[PDB]
Design an enzyme around this catalytic site. Structure first.
Site, mmCIF file in Angstrom:
data_model
loop_
_atom_site.group_PDB
_atom_site.id
_atom_site.type_symbol
_atom_site.label_atom_id
_atom_site.label_comp_id
_atom_site.label_asym_id
_atom_site.label_seq_id
_atom_site.Cartn_x
_atom_site.Cartn_y
_atom_site.Cartn_z
ATOM 1 N N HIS A 83 -3.532 -0.417 -3.146
ATOM 2 C CA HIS A 83 -3.661 -0.985 -1.805
ATOM 3 C C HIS A 83 -3.023 -0.079 -0.755
ATOM 4 O O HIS A 83 -2.189 0.763 -1.079
ATOM 5 C CB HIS A 83 -3.077 -2.409 -1.749
ATOM 6 C CG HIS A 83 -1.588 -2.489 -1.868
ATOM 7 N ND1 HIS A 83 -0.936 -2.545 -3.086
ATOM 8 C CD2 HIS A 83 -0.620 -2.606 -0.924
ATOM 9 C CE1 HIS A 83 0.363 -2.659 -2.885
ATOM 10 N NE2 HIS A 83 0.582 -2.697 -1.578
ATOM 11 N N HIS A 85 -0.762 0.123 1.582
ATOM 12 C CA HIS A 85 0.572 0.026 2.180
ATOM 13 C C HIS A 85 1.303 1.360 2.078
ATOM 14 O O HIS A 85 0.974 2.182 1.227
ATOM 15 C CB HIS A 85 1.405 -1.062 1.499
ATOM 16 C CG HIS A 85 1.141 -2.438 2.024
ATOM 17 N ND1 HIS A 85 1.511 -3.577 1.340
ATOM 18 C CD2 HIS A 85 0.544 -2.861 3.165
ATOM 19 C CE1 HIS A 85 1.151 -4.643 2.036
ATOM 20 N NE2 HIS A 85 0.568 -4.236 3.151
ATOM 21 N N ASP A 87 4.004 2.450 0.808
ATOM 22 C CA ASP A 87 4.665 2.921 -0.407
ATOM 23 C C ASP A 87 3.693 3.191 -1.545
ATOM 24 O O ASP A 87 4.116 3.477 -2.665
ATOM 25 C CB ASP A 87 5.764 1.948 -0.858
ATOM 26 C CG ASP A 87 5.264 0.543 -1.145
ATOM 27 O OD1 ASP A 87 4.184 0.145 -0.658
ATOM 28 O OD2 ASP A 87 5.993 -0.177 -1.861
ATOM 29 N N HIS A 88 2.396 3.136 -1.254
ATOM 30 C CA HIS A 88 1.408 3.564 -2.234
ATOM 31 C C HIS A 88 0.393 4.540 -1.656
ATOM 32 O O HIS A 88 -0.097 5.414 -2.375
ATOM 33 C CB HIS A 88 0.707 2.344 -2.838
ATOM 34 C CG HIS A 88 1.665 1.320 -3.353
ATOM 35 N ND1 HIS A 88 2.499 1.556 -4.428
ATOM 36 C CD2 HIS A 88 1.965 0.077 -2.907
ATOM 37 C CE1 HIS A 88 3.258 0.494 -4.633
ATOM 38 N NE2 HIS A 88 2.952 -0.418 -3.726
ATOM 39 N N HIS A 159 -2.531 -9.650 -2.091
ATOM 40 C CA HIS A 159 -1.410 -8.868 -1.585
ATOM 41 C C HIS A 159 -1.816 -8.103 -0.317
ATOM 42 O O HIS A 159 -1.071 -8.054 0.672
ATOM 43 C CB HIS A 159 -0.882 -7.909 -2.654
ATOM 44 C CG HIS A 159 0.321 -7.155 -2.197
ATOM 45 N ND1 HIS A 159 1.559 -7.746 -2.071
ATOM 46 C CD2 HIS A 159 0.461 -5.883 -1.752
ATOM 47 C CE1 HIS A 159 2.421 -6.861 -1.601
ATOM 48 N NE2 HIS A 159 1.779 -5.725 -1.399
ATOM 49 N N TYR A 190 5.454 -13.587 2.743
ATOM 50 C CA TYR A 190 4.194 -14.039 3.336
ATOM 51 C C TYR A 190 4.181 -15.533 3.647
ATOM 52 O O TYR A 190 4.658 -16.346 2.850
ATOM 53 C CB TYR A 190 3.007 -13.779 2.409
ATOM 54 C CG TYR A 190 2.625 -12.337 2.133
ATOM 55 C CD1 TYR A 190 3.400 -11.272 2.573
ATOM 56 C CD2 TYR A 190 1.468 -12.053 1.416
ATOM 57 C CE1 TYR A 190 3.023 -9.955 2.296
ATOM 58 C CE2 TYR A 190 1.086 -10.757 1.139
ATOM 59 C CZ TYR A 190 1.861 -9.708 1.580
ATOM 60 O OH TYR A 190 1.465 -8.413 1.300
ATOM 61 N N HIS A 224 4.219 -0.768 -8.899
ATOM 62 C CA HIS A 224 5.645 -0.773 -9.256
ATOM 63 C C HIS A 224 5.731 -0.971 -10.765
ATOM 64 O O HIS A 224 5.302 -2.005 -11.279
ATOM 65 C CB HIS A 224 6.412 -1.871 -8.515
ATOM 66 C CG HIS A 224 6.447 -1.682 -7.032
ATOM 67 N ND1 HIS A 224 7.415 -0.931 -6.402
ATOM 68 C CD2 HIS A 224 5.623 -2.130 -6.054
ATOM 69 C CE1 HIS A 224 7.193 -0.932 -5.099
ATOM 70 N NE2 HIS A 224 6.110 -1.651 -4.861
HETATM 71 O O1 LIG Z 1 5.884 -7.117 -8.216
HETATM 72 C C1 LIG Z 1 5.300 -6.343 -7.383
HETATM 73 O O2 LIG Z 1 4.055 -6.088 -7.558
HETATM 74 C C2 LIG Z 1 6.054 -5.730 -6.182
HETATM 75 C C3 LIG Z 1 7.373 -5.252 -6.392
HETATM 76 C C4 LIG Z 1 8.061 -4.696 -5.272
HETATM 77 C C5 LIG Z 1 7.384 -4.652 -4.013
HETATM 78 C C6 LIG Z 1 6.062 -5.170 -3.898
HETATM 79 C C7 LIG Z 1 5.368 -5.101 -2.601
HETATM 80 P P1 LIG Z 1 4.517 -3.379 -2.303
HETATM 81 O O3 LIG Z 1 3.554 -3.236 -3.467
HETATM 82 O O4 LIG Z 1 3.851 -3.447 -0.931
HETATM 83 O O5 LIG Z 1 5.720 -2.459 -2.335
HETATM 84 N N1 LIG Z 1 5.430 -5.686 -4.999
HETATM 85 ZN ZN LIG Z 2 2.104 -3.780 -0.640
#
Ligand SMILES: O=C(O)c1cccc(CP(=O)(O)O)n1
Ligand SMILES: [Zn+2]
Ligand SMILES: O=C(O)c1cccc(CP(=O)(O)O)n1
Ligand SMILES: O=C(O)c1cccc(CP(=O)(O)O)n1
Ligand SMILES: O=C(O)c1cccc(CP(=O)(O)O)n1
Ligand SMILES: [Zn+2]
Ligand SMILES: [Zn+2]
Ligand SMILES: [Zn+2]
Lengths: 266, 266, 266, 266
Positions: A83, A85, A87-88, A159, A190, A224
């Site tokens: 996705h 965002h 951090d990806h 998400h 959210y 993650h």
């Molecule tokens: O459990 C998860 O998928 C998880 C963990 C940390 C953070 C997030 C949000 P993002 O994927 O935007 O960092 N998701």
């Molecule tokens: Zn995200």
């Protein structure tokens, strides 16, 4: 008297930014991101594919690891995303400038990517990154083929509206390994119910739990690693404790149901 | 062992973020930004024009000052820009979402704006902001008319490729006042000579000094008020010490020549 | 020897291009397009909304009819779309240049609109038009409010991935009238089964039949009036023979089932 | 009664669409377009560059000729453009979808390309084509290097704001050959004086004549071969009658001066 607040940078846990050497997952698939952010390199006789890039400051590290794997900038053909965002998809714009790579994404991810993550349904402008354009728009269930490896898109909105799972079949010990790279199923801070920016949010999450549960899935990876119980620092046992897709979806739905109940109470 | 560095937010002097009430410049022209960042509101019987918006966190303040002037979100028709850096175009995306405003800019400013200031010729990705799209592309010398006030674009490339001066005629005491909003002529930390990303940089700055020198210019304003010797906190004498366009251009060229000599020595 | 073929223009039945004067549907809702292409004007005490614009050459006609209704270019605030094909979104780019209007659309429609309808899943580059940018992205079930009239988006993917029904409540004789502007449910020349560019096409159409069947729907309108048995040339009895949403959805599904059977045989 | 006119396709002389086999210009440079539209392939040990593509329907022909030269879709790395009109940038969007190619262009050409040539300063929406995005923005005098061949951009605004000459050095008989691909200097049906959409049009053309006159130019090529007295059908003597850059610029300026005088009289 009081000035407006300074802009606040998107800061993350140190482990999210801790570089690691390439960790092999299957015969052509490697983790080349950081200890706590997934970035998968798939190497084919006909170019390489990157799935996710992590944070914006990870571009040079990614290029270093590709080099270690025998992949030059010219050799990177395709970037896919879980996705869009920060951090990806953080380094995507820079990777496109510095490599031969083109981006394939669904319409929802493409428009968010083109906004650099601004005007987020939940985060507003709090978490932005350099914008990038998609070169190819994909539809649910559509396939993309590189050097003979076939990637299938499985939409799993929630998400983000454009959240996607990517699946492909690699090999290990002469046997096929069906790899599922499933997106996050979290909803951090959210508003779930009656959200004017995302009226069918709950329905989409429910559908996405079912989608993830049913993926072809010998090996599950997540953006993650902790979400699927991977430990990238654990060497030969990095993936030993990994969840099935079924367990990952069940855990996510239980957490989601708990958040819904808390929201009703809060 | 050592993680990659955290992202660093674009932070500025407190005075750049210090809100001020609207300060009248001429019969329909007001400063409505902060103490040290210009954002000009021009009010016409047929809608309002905003020239620059300052930093990204200034959107709500700008809307508050427009409200004080009798301008509702629906009433803002046009946003014009000096140049598309974060501290002048910062809130443009948000203003477009929250008002009726459309953006007019030259091609160079439009592409930088659409990138949210990323891949800057000199700053790289160090100073980004929410991206926005231009609704109208303008050419050098082109005019735009709102409620009968005529704005003329004067390209003055250098600080950015798309740097623009905007000129218009207002009134004060029944007499016409030719207002020139001239862009920055600074080159902060820039490689001036033999810059591969901007090979004709010096030629463009020289041409821009001449352009600014020749503007119709009863009153000069600049995106940083200090550059033209404005003091927005000084009330009735806010503009008393203001430079002419000729003096502003001469000062900028002398500073530029000094920087060139230092670069050669450094 | 043989040159490549000349480009072929998108030509349509003459009635699709036959201008008509404004035809009132309800207290604030008017048909202002052509005899066989719908373009709905909704007039509010706070600006006007246009739903669809028809073909690219219809822009000036639309502006003429708005003028007749008391709507100046400045007064048009919002353009909404059924789907982003040339014969419904054709004049959108020009309307944005010539009016105050901003476009709201879902992600799928926005990316197709931004491509000017090029690289269509089924038509390729055969039916293109001037590209335009969306100013606001909407999610399924999201509402937009103008001058107190509330428009609700109902996604009904199939004819295009971004196909949308728009619903709102007007009045007639002091009684509320729930208007449903439902998109096309046709699949003209489409490969329905096993389409690599649209793998879940059949599932999406089935879901969309159900969506349309359940719309709040005192009065149904469609982008081609014939699809809902409207006759815009029939004056006081223009809407007399109009289908219900239920009948429109049932007819579309029966036609669709017939096309599927023919495709299997062909 | 009278319907609005049908859309009219952009039709051209048959010779503009007449395919030809690859014609060698120098050791790594080939004409691979049609008899009367230039599309140059430059082949390097590190990928290929295409300069212009001609009309939209020429994509498959171009790919066929690349194949004949030993260049697969994966091997095409870069597309450069003279200017972003339909008969030179026509197939760019399709080429990007079907090859590894990325587009480099100046800001003016990039925004026109992204509009698919719509809202042209002179042609309006009369000559549109599939829109495409630029992957890299170049500045005047900037260089791009592929497989060791160095391409230099020389802006020559006029025919379009973004008109560019591209220069590079190839070899022939062990001697260097400085190739100049100069853009059109025509102004077909343009309003030259007092054009509100292009106020400095005449000044830009004058500057561009001087730019073209001074190019490094052992061999001149132009987007329409006739403009530089090339005859692509003439085999071994295809380039025998070719103009110098000086002669091309002088002819263009004389024609331009004649058009200015006629405009004043007309
Ligand atoms: O459990 C998860 O998928 C998880 C963990 C940390 C953070 C997030 C949000 P993002 O994927 O935007 O960092 N998701
Ligand atoms: Zn995200
Ligand atoms: O003298 C100036 O024009 C000046 C002053 C501070 C800073 C800058 C750079 P920016 O206009 O990007 O803030 N310029
Ligand atoms: O029945 C319909 O909805 C119908 C009729 C004619 C044509 C089309 C296709 P488009 O809506 O793209 O013109 N659909
Ligand atoms: O002499 C020329 O450069 C010439 C010839 C035919 C046509 C044109 C216009 P375009 O280059 O847009 O086809 N220019
Ligand atoms: Zn600046
Ligand atoms: Zn359609
Ligand atoms: Zn042209």
């Amino acid at each position: 008297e009081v000035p407006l607040p300074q802009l606040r940078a998107y800061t993350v846990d140190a482990s999210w930014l801790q570089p690691m050497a390439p960790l092999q997952i299957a015969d052509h698939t490697w983790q080349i991101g950081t200890e706590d952010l997934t970035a998968l390199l798939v190497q084919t006789p006909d170019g390489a594919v990157l799935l996710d890039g992590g944070m914006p400051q990870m571009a040079s590290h990614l290029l270093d690891n590709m080099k270690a794997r025998g992949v030059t900038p010219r050799d990177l053909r395709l970037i896919l995303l879980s996705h869009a965002h920060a951090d990806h998809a953080g380094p995507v714009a820079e990777l496109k400038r510095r490599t031969g790579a083109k981006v394939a994404a669904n319409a929802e991810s493409a428009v968010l990517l083109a906004r650099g993550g601004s005007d987020d349904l939940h985060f507003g402008d709090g978490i932005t990154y350099p914008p990038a354009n998609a070169d190819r728009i994909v539809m649910d269930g559509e396939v993309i083929t590189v050097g003979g490896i076939v990637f299938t898109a499985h939409f799993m909105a929630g998400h983000t509206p454009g959240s996607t799972a990517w699946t492909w079949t690699d090999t290990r010990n002469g046997k096929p390994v069906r790899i599922a790279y499933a997106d996050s199923l979290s909803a951090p801070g959210y508003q779930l119910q009656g959200n004017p920016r995302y009226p069918h949010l709950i329905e989409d999450y429910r559908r996405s739990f079912a989608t993830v549960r049913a993926l072809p899935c010998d090996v599950l990876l997540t953006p993650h690693p902790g979400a699927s119980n991977w430990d990238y620092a654990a060497g030969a046992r990095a993936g030993a404790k990994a969840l099935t897709c079924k367990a990952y979806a069940d855990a996510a739905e239980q957490k989601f149901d708990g958040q819904l109940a808390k929201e009703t109470a809060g």
